[PDB]
């Protein structure tokens, strides 16, 4: 029979809801088709990421190492399930011993000899109070564990590979409008030139021109250097190197990713990978008590052969000199000093760690998905606004210019304009990144792209 | 006996006083309440901090881990405690075997059987040359190891809470000054859209005021998210949700923490718990060595039981079926080929291991009190250099709006005095926080806060 | 006999010449003297960058626990490679026992005694199959996997501690600028206080100079901590304190490091020490499936043991009493429930799991210094143009300068001038830091300095 506790899965210690405030819209409530349900194909648009995520579906060491761990996993179950069962071996076994005579069978000193071989099993468990079987099912869920800790590692390579096609793509965006803004003030730099050596354009705005065009040059080799890094990154988690033929990938300023639901923080419990893997340790810890509480009641044994016995090696396998062997083992524990109620003792706090360990597992996940619902809540007000500020400083640096082909303003209005478009573009880049980031990582926190079409 | 090496705590090989520079006050020397013996709630004056920390330490789920670790390796250090005593149990057996002629008794086959109860101990290892006590006493030692990390848990917890609490708070300052700078500059452009329209302002003023506008949104959307964030880790690091009825807190510009004394270096020997931890880890590393000696030494084993015997099973518990066993047993190692050489050579290096690890904690935690002692000796000049930059900004701003209600300026001079306002208030936010930061990290440098109230 | 399977190196899953691109310069190709083999005394040119890594290599505690991990892995090998042979010890054995009639030899109950004093080895396994010497194997394998990880250790080490310096002595140029740069400021603003108490200058100039005082000062505060810190993480890397009496260092302007050649990434295989060190780890794996499989072909046990025996006591070691015990066996399994066959499965996909590493750690080492390799074909271009703005923006604050002697312009553009020359200057002391960062990052990558003089 078992020993082991019913298992009762803890409460979520977390609110019932998604914090609700300035930064977060309505809660939606449960979702028809939840997010772990919806696709990585579907979620993201760009078919060149598609075929990258591919690629690394299929060549990433670490998810390789993490699929591997759960045939490991696998066979540590089939080993523990295996220890039910007798080991059935054959044994050949001699003794050949010289004794003195006061231990002799005759008296007088003497070479006595034995042999044998045999078919049996030796010192086989009999489960009767499920200490193996205990055994076997701890084994059975850390297993289980595995299976949830390899969805967990491919969605967060799946979320991984997203960042980084995504931060090389805004880095090229970067460079090329540092490109763009590199040309326009080596044009005007070379005009105030051509207008200085005419004595027309002062020094100051000559000076002036300088500074911006070294500066663009400095963040121009900046940006191609992040670019080249941003290429080793994704080539690095792809674990192969990036396809020739890719289809035609889409622009930052694109509907790239479709927006995933919310639903309750309870989905988390039955579609986050990690908070399943915690839960199957738990269900294991658990599993593990009934061990510990089978020490203490009766272990049975066998042992029992059947096969050939003589003595002497000519008289074996021959008729008349067959023997068999049957001999049972009870022995049960009344004094140990302690010991195996500190071993109960052990189990028990084990399976309290794991309940902490699940439960904290469930306050992580509900803490990544309130921040990425607050990072939806606010993006597209931050991205609105940056275009706004984008448009205006557009807007007087165009003024401004309209107003310089009629003199009146020096030549350092400008160039301040100018300075200031590009770092707004610079920053809606950044922001236009940081919002798609926000959102792959609320995908992955809840529940992530395990499936590739949508469930 | 026990072949325990005498334990002698390694000297600390950092310097006998905090480093001494332009980034260090005078050196305070020994204190008469070291920082360690100072209560949390004595070093956070704000009381709903206390309640937070209370909260946190109630209910946070790694400390709940710690803890239930404590149990565990006490757990462990009473199993090793209980195998010095011999394990008493009941056994029961029986052998039922037949055996050929020239093997039986009878000269032809024969089936023999034989049955016992007894109530003994069997291969009870008598701990002559100390290595079960050894094995305990490094269990024992793991196990105040693992008290003092617990210890240091809750220091970095509450630290943690603190760092929280006060990133929070500082969001939500900064939240609120772009909230009324915002609506400064939502003012001041309905003002110049109404001037423009007369024909007084120009599209300059104009665009240059929308720009602000724009800007000061976008900074508005992302300290809103950032508020909503900070909240959520919080909430986190809590374990538990917020509760309603929290006392009032006190803002940043109050006096949060008390100024804790820095102590001699030695101090951390005995006050700071991972060094603690360290130093008894060390303590079972040479607790092991007495295990590894105690090997090449005899082994002495008992095997002893007295109980019921006989051949027919309906003979057990029968009067004259009574039978006793008494066997002893020595043994001392010879040869092994350099094996118990290399298990001591083993157990030597661990002890190094631990050594080094000890060593490199003392000058871990020395770096680490260095450093929040620069950052004590230099937040000040800071705080007031920024202080003083805040007020001449605002100077400045008064100034030039003084200035344009008699017109002579532009609409330019105006808006660059507010962003320069507007940025000189974030990095007075964001450095106060740096201080208020460095200040906790180096009361939980020095001993943390494991004491609630003051010892 | 062994049965181990051939080691064949994994294929390198990179391609066969690092990234080619607008950030990368032209592959130099194979190396006559590569990276690994240039010592660490000649790739830092600065003495005191050189007595410092001594200082470290000697007293660093990290690497100290690494030398010693060496010497336990040793230990280890040594106590598998002890295995194969008998362990011969003295063992002295007696038993007295109580025997009812029906078991008794005298046909009523009788006290049976039995001593022995014998020289032997019991169950000393002869590996026939090679099992045991498959664990040696691995542990051997293990132990080359830790002496390169030592290596590992040194390179990442030496790394830190150039990071360290030259963090260190950037942060101290920075807190020079910021002297030098307040100075100025504090001269400009007492002038300005002058020129106003005499109704010249306005409270606007006033209030600008004021605010460029107090940023400086504030800087310099925070420059000052950041030097103190900089010199406690060095303190930490080194493990001792600083010399007293240390060579005279080279200044950032200088030239400090050798230029040190990319060579072809197979170079890795065999010259990076984390890609030996998966290596022998893989062997170590490989290793082991020998031990799996010799577990289902027949174990073979050997007790043996010459000594004498007696019935009494008094008659051990007496003419006549000597007695001798040969006691070979043989097991082969039959069925295990799959056990056996699960255990050969858990090995193979150890191998397999190890082989995913070995690949990562190549595909790793192949991203770090294709990262190098951007950073050295960019920071040139980016240092070049950061020393160019540098110069036009000290053109510009000269020519501002040499105009405000004689009036025209107001007291604003000249601090303009100012702080955008200090930026600028903070700048290239950043940048001059991060590529000097980087070709130290990519000497570790490529090999790393584990030989002080070069090879
Ligand atoms: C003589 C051998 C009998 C050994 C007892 C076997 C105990 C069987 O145990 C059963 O085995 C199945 C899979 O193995 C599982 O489905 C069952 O849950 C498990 O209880
Ligand atoms: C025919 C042998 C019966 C074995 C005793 C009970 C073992 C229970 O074990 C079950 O035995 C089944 C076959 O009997 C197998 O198909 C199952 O895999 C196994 O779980
Ligand atoms: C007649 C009494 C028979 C005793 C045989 C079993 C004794 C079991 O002992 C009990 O086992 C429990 C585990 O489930 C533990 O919780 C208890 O601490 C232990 O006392
Ligand atoms: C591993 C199984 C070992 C037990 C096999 C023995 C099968 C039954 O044992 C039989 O018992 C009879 C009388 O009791 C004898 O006459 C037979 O010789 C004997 O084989
Ligand atoms: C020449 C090398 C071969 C060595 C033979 C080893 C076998 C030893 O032979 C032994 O000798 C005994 C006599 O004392 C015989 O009675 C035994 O039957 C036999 O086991
Ligand atoms: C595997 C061990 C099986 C060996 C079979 C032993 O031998 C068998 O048993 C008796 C002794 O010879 C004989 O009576 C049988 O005829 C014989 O086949
Ligand atoms: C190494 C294992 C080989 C198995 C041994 C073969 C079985 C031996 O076979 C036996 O040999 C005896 C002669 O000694 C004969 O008396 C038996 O009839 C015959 O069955
Ligand atoms: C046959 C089993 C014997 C059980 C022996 C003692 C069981 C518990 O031990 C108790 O703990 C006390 C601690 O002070 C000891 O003094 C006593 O042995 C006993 O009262
Ligand atoms: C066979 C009896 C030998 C002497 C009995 C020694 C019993 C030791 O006493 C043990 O001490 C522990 C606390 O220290 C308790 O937890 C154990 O229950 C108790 O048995
Ligand atoms: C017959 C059982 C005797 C076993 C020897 C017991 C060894 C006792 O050992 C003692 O036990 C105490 C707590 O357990 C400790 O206070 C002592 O330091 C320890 O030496
Ligand atoms: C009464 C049994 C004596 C046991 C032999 C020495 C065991 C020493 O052990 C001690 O025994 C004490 C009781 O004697 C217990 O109170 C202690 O917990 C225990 O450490
Ligand atoms: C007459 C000689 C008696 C030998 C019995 C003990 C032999 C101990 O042997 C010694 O034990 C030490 C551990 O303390 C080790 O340091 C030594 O290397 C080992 O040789
Ligand atoms: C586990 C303890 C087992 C030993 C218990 C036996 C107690 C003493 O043994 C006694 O010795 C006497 C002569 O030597 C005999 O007359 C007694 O029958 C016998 O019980
Ligand atoms: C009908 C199912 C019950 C099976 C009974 C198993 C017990 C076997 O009975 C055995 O048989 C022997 C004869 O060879 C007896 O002499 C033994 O006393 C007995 O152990
Ligand atoms: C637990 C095992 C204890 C069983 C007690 C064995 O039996 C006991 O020993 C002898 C044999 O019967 C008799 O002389 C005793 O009267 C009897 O009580
Ligand atoms: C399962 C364990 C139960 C313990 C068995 C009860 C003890 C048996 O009791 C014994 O039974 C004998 C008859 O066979 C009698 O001769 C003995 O007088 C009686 O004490
Ligand atoms: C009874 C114990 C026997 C001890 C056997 C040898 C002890 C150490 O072994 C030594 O190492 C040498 C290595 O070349 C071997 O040649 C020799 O066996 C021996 O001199
Ligand atoms: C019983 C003797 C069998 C042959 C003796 C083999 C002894 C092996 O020699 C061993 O080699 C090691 C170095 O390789 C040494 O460290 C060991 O001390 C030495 O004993
Ligand atoms: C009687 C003792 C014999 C035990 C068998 C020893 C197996 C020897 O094994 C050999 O030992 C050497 C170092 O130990 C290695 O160089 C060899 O590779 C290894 O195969
Ligand atoms: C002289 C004892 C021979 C031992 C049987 C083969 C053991 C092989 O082992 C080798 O033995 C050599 C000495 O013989 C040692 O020098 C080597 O260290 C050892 O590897
Ligand atoms: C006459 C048949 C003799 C069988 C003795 C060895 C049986 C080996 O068995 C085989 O060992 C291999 C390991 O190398 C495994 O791959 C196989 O799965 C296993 O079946
Ligand atoms: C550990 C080694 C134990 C075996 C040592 C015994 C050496 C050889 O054994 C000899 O065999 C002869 C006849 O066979 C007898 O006359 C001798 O008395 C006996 O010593
Ligand atoms: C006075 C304390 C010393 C106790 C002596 C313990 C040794 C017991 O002495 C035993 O008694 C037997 C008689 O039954 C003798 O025949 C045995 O030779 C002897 O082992
Ligand atoms: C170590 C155990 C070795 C003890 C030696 C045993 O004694 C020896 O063997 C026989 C019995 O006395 C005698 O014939 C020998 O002369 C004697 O030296
Ligand atoms: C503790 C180990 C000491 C070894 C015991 C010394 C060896 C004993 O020596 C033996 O003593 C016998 C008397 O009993 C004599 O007959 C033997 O001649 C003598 O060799
Ligand atoms: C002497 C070795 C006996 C081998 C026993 C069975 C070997 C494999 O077991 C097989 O698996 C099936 C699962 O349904 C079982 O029904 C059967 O026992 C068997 O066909
Ligand atoms: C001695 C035979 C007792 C009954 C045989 C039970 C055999 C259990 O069957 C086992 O089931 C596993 C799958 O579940 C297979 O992998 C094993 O190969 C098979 O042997
Ligand atoms: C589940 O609750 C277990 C039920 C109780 C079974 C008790 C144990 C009986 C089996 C013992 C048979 C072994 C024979 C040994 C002969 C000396
Ligand atoms: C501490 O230094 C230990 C002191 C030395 C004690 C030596 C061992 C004596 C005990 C042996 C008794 C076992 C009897 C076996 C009978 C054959
Ligand atoms: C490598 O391929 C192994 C070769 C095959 C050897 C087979 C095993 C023979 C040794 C057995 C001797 C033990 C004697 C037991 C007596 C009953």
Known sequence: ?????????????????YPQGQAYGQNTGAAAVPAADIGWREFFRDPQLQQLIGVALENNRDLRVAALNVEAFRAQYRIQRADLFPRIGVDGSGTRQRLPGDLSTTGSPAISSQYGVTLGTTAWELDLFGRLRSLRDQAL?????????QRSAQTTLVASVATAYLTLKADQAQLQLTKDTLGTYQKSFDLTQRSYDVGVASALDLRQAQTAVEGARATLAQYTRLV????????LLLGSGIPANLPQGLGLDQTLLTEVPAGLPSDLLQRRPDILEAEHQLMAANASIGAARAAFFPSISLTANAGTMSRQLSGLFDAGSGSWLFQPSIN???????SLRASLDYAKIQKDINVAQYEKAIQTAFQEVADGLAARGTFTEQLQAQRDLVKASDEYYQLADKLFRTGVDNYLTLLAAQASLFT?????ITDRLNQLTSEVNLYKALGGGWNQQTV
Chains 1, 2, 3 share one sequence.
């Open 141 to 149: 869920e850390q297993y289980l564990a595995t299976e949830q800790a």
């Open 228 to 235: 080249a890094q941003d290429q080793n990154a994704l080539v």
């Open 1 to 17: 029979c078992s020993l082991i506790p019913d298992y009762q899965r803890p409460e979520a210690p977390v609110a019932a809801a």
């Open 332 to 338: 049960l524990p009344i004094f140990t000093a302690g």
């Open 424 to 428: 707004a573009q610079q920053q809606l």
